[PDB]
Structures are given as structure tokens and as C-alpha cells.
Symmetry: C2
Amino acid sequence: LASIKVIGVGGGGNNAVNRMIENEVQGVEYIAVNTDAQALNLSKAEVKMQIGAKLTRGLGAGANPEVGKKAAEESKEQIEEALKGADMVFVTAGMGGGTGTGAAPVIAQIAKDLGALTVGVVTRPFTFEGRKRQLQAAGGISAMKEAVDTLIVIPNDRILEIVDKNTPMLEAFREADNVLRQGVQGISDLIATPGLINLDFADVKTIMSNKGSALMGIGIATGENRAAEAAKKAISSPLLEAAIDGAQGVLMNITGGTNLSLYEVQEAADIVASASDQDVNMIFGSVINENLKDEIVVTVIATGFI
Amino acid sequence: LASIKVIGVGGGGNNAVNRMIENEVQGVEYIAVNTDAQALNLSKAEVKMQIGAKLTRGLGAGANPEVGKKAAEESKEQIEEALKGADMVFVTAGMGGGTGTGAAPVIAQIAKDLGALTVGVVTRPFTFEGRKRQLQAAGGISAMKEAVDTLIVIPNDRILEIVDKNTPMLEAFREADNVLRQGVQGISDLIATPGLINLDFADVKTIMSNKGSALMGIGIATGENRAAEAAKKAISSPLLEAAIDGAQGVLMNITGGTNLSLYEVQEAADIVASASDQDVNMIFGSVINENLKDEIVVTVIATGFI
Ligand SMILES: [K+]
Ligand SMILES: [K+]
């Protein structure tokens, strides 16, 4: 199985890494990277890497991408050494602030230069976060795209379409953390641990080598008709904010409990295939999570959008 | 038993509250309060109070005490409602940043105006954090002193005298979090839960009503001579950065396992009394922590320093 590191960069990455650990996501090594020593000390990762100790003295980057970038530059030797040996590196961060925006591209570029298949999974800030955050996030996304093989972008505004109408702001942020965790786990669960219908690493690498950007969609369903319902919810997810038939590559993960059947996996796959372009390169796998009972989760990652 | 709330304000308070929860500190209600939604979502407290949602949009106060203050002002109705009914409120924060420095005094003043015995337990930043942090912390400490009954100040530089010489910066910060937890738990364990030698709430209130400032000291020891060794370490703690004989009031907590003896409690108390002024108002109690084996911890809180 592939050797996989998941790197949480800055506050958005910190929370996503903790959510993966809370969900007992197996087969990956976690590395929390941050300029903010207080936040870093709340990481559940065993490897906690403080960057920019001299520059920022543990105080964070103050929403300044240049300080995030220079912090990662300060610590480039340590970052390179931590990443050495990985076949694949996920770099997770929230865009718009200082450390995510500035450090995540530096870290991703280091991983990519080492030869790791490098996948960024990042949030674009909620519009309510304001103009400075939006502008800085656009800069980070552009930098991230240069530094990775595939960048999966989670449009946080779309979460607001998904959650209940009176959801407090704190809970909207909490859901963004969960979506980042779902983005990484959707891919890693199919390659990091044994399974009946895993994915071939080489095939993941091919779908993750497309240009342009990538998006994700998530569907969850229970009971009768769950496989079809979950798949339909995934392809119609507000998160997948382009028509899936525009994608060059599609990866589908269906996860269920021990009762997940061949018939259900096929049903879900057929829905996603049918919605996608006729000439799409689509790959899929299934995961048994024995902690699930009657729910199934379908995650779709679509790459190579114009 | 007294009804006690422990309020973690901003990043330093967040980490201290999590450390209390990790150490299974009983008998108190925890409330995490923050302008930073990502950090707040890592709180282990069941009550998570986002303040300044409109002003800061979940992004934190950017090391600006005025923004911390105005965030608390925005949310004053919610803060007042959360604090109603408490006999005692601990307000814990790191001084020097925006939310701790600015919001903690507002919150403490609300608690004090409600009639709660209000005790602040705050860190003064490490010198390495720089001049802006030092100056802002001095302002916060002055504000905090006006807003509480007793302010216990933890001089972070003194932690550097305590930890091993090559301790990384991240671990020095982690130890500050632990000291804040020890400051609160030293007092709360003697009044919040049943015990053989608890303290009288009225007596705690008297020692906590002194003017001037307060300091703490911690000593830990195992094996033969543990009670005397721990007590001596507490009174000579670099954290207690004034001669204990200068204090008007002294509170001592000795905590040990089920083997903690009357003789040991007395031995420790005698050491602290002997070191203190002849006319000191000193009170003490003991706690059995059945999770301890042969270690004992002595905590001393000294109040009313000139
Ligand atoms: K698997
Ligand atoms: K007790």
C-alpha cells in the first residue's frame, strides 16, 4: 500500500486533521504544521511541526500570506525532511489567512519536488469573511495550483446551501472542517489500507495529473434505495459547483457498513458514470466501515475542469 | 458546594480549559469564549461561546485588544446570561494578544457585577514574544486587576527557568497552558467537590479579596520525604517571583493519592506557614486524586502583595 502523509497547514488544516483523527482515518501519517503555537498544541497529530519560530515567535502569521510564506521558507529544511519518503502527500488548509495561504504552497511544492503525488484540499472562505479574505484566498488558490498535482477546492458558501437555514456561524465553520476531512478520506481510504475493491495507486495518479481545477461532492443516505439516493446526492451536491459532465477524471468512493452489497456498489457507480461525460476517465472503489450501520456515504472527486 | 464556572478566554484560555478537561477536573462548568471560530471548534468544553461574530466574522481579534474588548461588548448580553447563577467565576486567558487582553476584563467585570467571586488566572508573555506583546499584556493586566477580586499572574519567562535548558518553544508554550490549569485546579479542587479537608467558601472569599496582585507556586515530589520536598519546591518556585513572606493571604493545596497521610498534610502546611509572614491569613486543604500513586503536588497561591 502507498505511503501517505496528510499535512494540516494553519488553522483550517489543524481542524481538518483533528477531524480525520476523531474519525479514526487509518493508514496515513499526520503532520500538523503551524506558525501558531497555541493552535498547534491543540493538534491531535503526534507530529507537530512549528514553522517560523524565529519570524513569528509562536504567534501566528496575522492573516498575512507573506509571513506564512516566509515562515515555511525559514523551516524548509525541516519540512523537506518530514516529507521525504512519502508516495503521496495531502496538503490541507483554509485559504484566505496567513499561514494556510502563504505556507501551504511552499509545503506542497516541496512535496511535489520530492516526487510525491501531491493533492491540495483547501477551502475558499465564506463571503461573510469579507473582501480581504476573498482576495487573499484567490492568491493562495493560484499559488496552490502551481504547487500541486491536483487542487480540490471546497467553496465554503455552498455549505450554507447544505446546512439548516438558521445554523450559527460557529457550526458552519465546523462543517467546513468536516468537508475537508471528507475530501481527504474519500481518496485515502481507497489506497491507504487493505480492501476488497481498493484503487490502484497508478490509476489515482493518472486522474490526479489533470490540469485545471478539481471539485468534490458528498451524498449520505439510509435505508431502502440508499445506494442510489447517496450517489444522486453526491453528484447534485452544492459543493460540486460545476456540471460533473465537464470533468476529465472522476473518482468515486462508496463507503458503507458490513451490509454493503455488490449490487449497491454497482448501482452507485452506474449513477455517477451516467452523469459524467461519455469519455470520462472514471475509477471507483468501496470501503467497509464496520462502525456504520445502515448509512452509506458516496464521495465524488471530479478533476480536470476547464 | 459552590457553583463555579471556569471561562477560557481567547487562545491561552482555550488551551488551559482543554488541559483542565484532559485532567478530569471535577465540579466546575466550563465555558470557552472566543472570537476565533477555528480555535473555538477545538475546545473540549460543551459550552462554546463565539463572541464578536459580527465584528470579526469568526476570524479572531488580530492581536488587537480594542477588537477583543469590542467583541465582548457586542456579546455582553450573552456573556451576562451564561454567567448568571455562579458563586465563583475563574477567568483564564493569555495576556498580550487581542481577545485575551481585551475581552477577559469585560467578561470578568460582568461576573464581578453579578456578584460572583471573580478570580483571573492569566499568563504574562515570554520576553521572546516581543515588545508589542509585552506592552499590550501590561495594559491587559491593569484592566484585569480592576475587573476581578484577585488576579493571579503567571510570569511565562519563569517557566524557562523550570523546564530543561533545550526545551523547544512549542513545549514552553504547552507548559504555560499546564501552569494556568494548575492555578485554577489548585483552588477549585478545594471547593468544587466533596473532600475530607476542603476549604470553606467564605474563607476563600476573604483571601481572594485582598488588593495588589497574586502569584502561584507549584512543587511536585515522589517517595520518601515527598510532602516536605513538594512544599519546599512550591515556596521556592520561580513562578512565585516574590518572597512569600510578603503576602497578606496564602492558600495551600496538597494533592496526593489514597496513601496521602495526615502527617504529610501537616508537614507540608507547616513548611508553608513557616515561610510566610507571622501575621499571614493562611488556609489550606488536601485532595485525594486516586489516579496518583506516589507523587504529591503542592500548590500555593499567595495574595495581597505590595
Ligand atoms: K481500504
Ligand atoms: K474536593
